[PDB]
Enzyme design. Structure first.
Site, PDB file in Angstrom:
ATOM      1  N   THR A   1       0.897  -1.221   0.000  1.00 25.23           N
ATOM      2  CA  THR A   1       0.000   0.000   0.000  1.00 25.23           C
ATOM      3  C   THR A   1       0.902   1.227   0.000  1.00 25.23           C
ATOM      4  O   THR A   1       2.056   1.142   0.447  1.00 25.23           O
ATOM      5  CB  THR A   1      -0.917  -0.030   1.256  1.00 25.23           C
ATOM      6  OG1 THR A   1      -1.595  -1.275   1.266  1.00 25.23           O
ATOM      7  CG2 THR A   1      -1.989   1.128   1.310  1.00 25.23           C
ATOM      8  N   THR A  19      -3.107   0.533  -3.479  1.00 24.35           N
ATOM      9  CA  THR A  19      -2.486  -0.734  -3.093  1.00 24.35           C
ATOM     10  C   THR A  19      -2.651  -1.918  -4.074  1.00 24.35           C
ATOM     11  O   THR A  19      -3.530  -1.921  -4.912  1.00 24.35           O
ATOM     12  CB  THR A  19      -2.937  -1.146  -1.691  1.00 24.35           C
ATOM     13  OG1 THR A  19      -2.146  -2.226  -1.193  1.00 24.35           O
ATOM     14  CG2 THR A  19      -4.340  -1.653  -1.759  1.00 24.35           C
ATOM     15  N   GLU A  21      -2.287  -4.849  -2.160  1.00 29.24           N
ATOM     16  CA  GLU A  21      -2.388  -5.631  -0.931  1.00 29.24           C
ATOM     17  C   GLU A  21      -1.051  -5.942  -0.267  1.00 29.24           C
ATOM     18  O   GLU A  21      -0.427  -5.065   0.280  1.00 29.24           O
ATOM     19  CB  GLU A  21      -3.285  -6.856  -1.072  1.00 29.24           C
ATOM     20  CG  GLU A  21      -4.073  -7.187   0.168  1.00 29.24           C
ATOM     21  CD  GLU A  21      -3.201  -7.383   1.412  1.00 29.24           C
ATOM     22  OE1 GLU A  21      -2.790  -6.430   2.044  1.00 29.24           O
ATOM     23  OE2 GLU A  21      -2.933  -8.618   1.742  1.00 29.24           O
ATOM     24  N   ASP A  43      -8.299  -9.854   1.585  1.00 32.47           N
ATOM     25  CA  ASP A  43      -8.890  -8.939   2.568  1.00 32.47           C
ATOM     26  C   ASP A  43     -10.335  -9.331   2.948  1.00 32.47           C
ATOM     27  O   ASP A  43     -10.858  -8.800   3.893  1.00 32.47           O
ATOM     28  CB  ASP A  43      -8.863  -7.469   2.100  1.00 32.47           C
ATOM     29  CG  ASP A  43      -7.521  -6.756   2.366  1.00 32.47           C
ATOM     30  OD1 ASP A  43      -6.546  -7.369   2.886  1.00 32.47           O
ATOM     31  OD2 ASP A  43      -7.455  -5.535   2.032  1.00 32.47           O
ATOM     32  N   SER A  62     -11.580  -2.788   3.108  1.00 35.81           N
ATOM     33  CA  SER A  62     -10.236  -2.185   3.108  1.00 35.81           C
ATOM     34  C   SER A  62      -9.982  -1.426   4.409  1.00 35.81           C
ATOM     35  O   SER A  62     -10.910  -0.896   4.991  1.00 35.81           O
ATOM     36  CB  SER A  62     -10.079  -1.202   1.920  1.00 35.81           C
ATOM     37  OG  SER A  62      -8.750  -0.647   1.912  1.00 35.81           O
ATOM     38  N   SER A  63      -8.744  -1.369   4.898  1.00 35.31           N
ATOM     39  CA  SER A  63      -8.445  -0.436   5.980  1.00 35.31           C
ATOM     40  C   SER A  63      -7.888   0.926   5.483  1.00 35.31           C
ATOM     41  O   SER A  63      -7.476   1.772   6.279  1.00 35.31           O
ATOM     42  CB  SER A  63      -7.454  -1.093   6.928  1.00 35.31           C
ATOM     43  OG  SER A  63      -6.321  -1.486   6.153  1.00 35.31           O
ATOM     44  N   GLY A  83      -0.228   0.376   5.628  1.00 34.87           N
ATOM     45  CA  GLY A  83       0.067  -0.393   6.842  1.00 34.87           C
ATOM     46  C   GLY A  83      -0.983  -1.393   7.286  1.00 34.87           C
ATOM     47  O   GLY A  83      -1.064  -1.703   8.487  1.00 34.87           O
ATOM     48  N   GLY A  84      -1.768  -1.906   6.350  1.00 34.51           N
ATOM     49  CA  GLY A  84      -2.825  -2.911   6.653  1.00 34.51           C
ATOM     50  C   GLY A  84      -3.764  -2.461   7.765  1.00 34.51           C
ATOM     51  O   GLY A  84      -4.260  -1.337   7.756  1.00 34.51           O
TER      52      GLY A  84
END
Lengths: 175, 359
Positions: A1, A19, A21, A43, A62-63, A83-84
């Protein structure tokens, strides 16, 4: 990302998180075309049922959290990060440090962060001063941010030291 | 030299901030040369695709929030990937069936979503662009075709993900004689440069149709995925409306589902407000941060998904009385060993169309 941001002289503001992923996604490259393919569907929840279960034509949760803060209806700050799961923690902390603690933007971005999404999952940056925090720190997120000063008609750009990132201001000059 | 770049800059006409100096140079140039912020953003995405290739680009998707200087509306080009029509709810389960281990899962054709990034860029230019995709992609064609020197982060990524790269055509680019490219080595991406030239000449149909679409599809299937040429043909972005919150005299505009991030970015400071945060390195501050995260991340696992498909209790998650319930669970000196999702449905209408399932 990755997260980036742009502001122009006409008042347009972009905050953009993007991103594939994982690093390098699936690792699959379209042969003869050089395109690396995302693993974005991981995800989704692996076990269905599930607000975030897999479905055909559904988008995985998604975050990514590109954000713009406004004061008296004008944009004043952009924030975002890769950063997930840690993303919201990086964005929250930056805003908290810059606004609530009134730190200058680069200091706010560089202030050591923490993350925990459960009792079994903790991360901290070097030096939160020496729960289940581990024995060594790790970098969390990578915030790029622009602040906008409407009064002086200036911009400040910041890249987070967790990557090699660069801020470049535009300063048009008459010879 | 990468060493010579700023992480803090100022300007009077303009500002760019990105994770790669060469992408920043490209975006700033577009601004120099009379582009807007949208033009520059589109140039930046193509540059990052070449120079920070492990992190984003036309094989992926994203969320592009844009405040429009003209209209004063804030909108989001949501280019998040979609599952192919052939996807199934149990596609990541083995025969038993429990979950194909993450790190294997990543790595399969079933993981590949229909890419949206390029569709999003086209949309952004249609709405706000003053420069053509042809102009904006050109600096990245040069970086792909001619090379640049890899930075430390890309170098570490190639090294760290060598096994996965090995496994696929990517090895020809990143591993080029069986050895990982190293910091300062020139990365040349001839095939990617050719794909960008196809996009420059033919537009986005170079990606979503004909012979590239066929090969992308064929490749995904060969790895075990169901993606089809029709899936690529069908793809479009969505225009999402930001969700907003008041915060310390500011308004926060942030991204709604299918992002989980926006709701909890709004929820966390609402929970924290009661406690008046505000020494920056005290145990108190970190304790309150951690306890709040535990609550918000639990709600995330229970209640968030794509709002085209599932009923996310937005109203209910950021209802004041719900916030109060969550604030009551947090104590300065102890920790809740058993943080759980709350019940936001008390505070709004309707009901969940999905079950709570352990992962």
């Amino acid at each position: 990302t990755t997260h980036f941001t742009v502001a122009d002289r006409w008042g347009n503001v972009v905050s953009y998180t993007t991103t594939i992923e994982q690093l390098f996604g699936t690792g699959i490259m379209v042969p003869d075309y050089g395109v690396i393919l995302n693993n974005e569907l991981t995800d989704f929840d692996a076990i269905p049922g599930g607000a975030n279960e897999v479905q055909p034509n559904k988008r995985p949760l998604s975050s990514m959290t590109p954000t713009i803060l406004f004061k008296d209806d004008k944009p004043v700050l952009t924030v975002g990060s890769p950063g997930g799961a840690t993303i919201i923690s990086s964005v929250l902390q930056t805003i908290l440090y810059h606004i609530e603690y009134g730190m200058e933007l680069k200091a706010a971005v560089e202030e050591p962060r923490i993350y925990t999404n459960s009792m079994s999952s903790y991360r901290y940056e070097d030096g939160v001063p020496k729960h289940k925090f581990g024995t060594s720190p790790v970098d969390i997120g990578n915030v790029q941010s622009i602040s906008i000063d409407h009064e002086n008609g200036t911009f400040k750009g910041v890249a987070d030291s967790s990557r090699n990132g660069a801020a470049i201001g535009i300063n048009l000059k008459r010879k | 030299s990468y060493d010579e770049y700023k992480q803090v800059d100022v300007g009077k006409d303009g500002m760019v901030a990105t994770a790669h100096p060469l992408a920043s140079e490209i975006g700033a140039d577009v601004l120099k040369k009379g582009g807007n912020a949208i033009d520059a953003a589109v140039a930046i995405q193509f540059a990052l695709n070449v120079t920070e290739p492990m992190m984003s680009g036309i094989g992926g998707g994203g969320f592009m929030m844009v405040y429009d200087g003209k209209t004063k509306d804030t909108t989001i080009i949501d280019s998040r990937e979609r599952a192919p029509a052939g996807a199934t709810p149990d596609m990541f389960l083995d025969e038993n069936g429990k979950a194909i281990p993450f790190s294997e899962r990543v790595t399969k054709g079933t993981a590949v979503g229909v890419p949206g990034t390029l569709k999003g860029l086209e949309e952004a230019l249609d709405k706000w662009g003053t420069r053509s995709m042809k102009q904006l992609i050109t600096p990245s064609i040069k970086l792909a075709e001619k090379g640049f020197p890899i930075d430390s982060v890309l170098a570490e990524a190639i090294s760290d993900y060598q096994e996965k790269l090995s496994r696929t055509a990517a090895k020809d680019v990143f591993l080029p004689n069986g050895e990982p490219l190293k910091e300062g080595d020139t990365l040349i991406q001839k095939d990617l440069a050719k794909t960008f030239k196809l996009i420059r000449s033919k537009g986005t149909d170079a990606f979503y149709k004909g012979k590239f679409a066929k090969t992308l599809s064929d490749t995904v299937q060969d790895f075990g995925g169901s993606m089809t040429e029709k899936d690529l043909e069908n793809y479009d972005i969505t225009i999402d409306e930001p969700i907003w919150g008041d915060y310390q005299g500011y308004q926060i505009a942030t991204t709604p589902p299918p992002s989980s991030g926006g709701i909890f970015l709004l929820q966390m400071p609402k929970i924290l407000d009661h406690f008046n945060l505000s020494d920056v390195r005290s145990w108190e501050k970190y304790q309150l941060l951690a306890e709040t995260m535990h609550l918000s991340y639990a709600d995330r696992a229970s209640y968030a998904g794509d709002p085209e498909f599932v009923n996310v209790p937005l109203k209910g998650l950021l209802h004041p009385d719900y916030i109060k319930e969550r604030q009551q669970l947090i104590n300065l000196d102890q920790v809740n060993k058993k943080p759980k999702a709350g019940d936001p449905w008390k505070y709004q209408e309707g009901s969940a169309n999905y079950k709570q399932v352990e992962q």
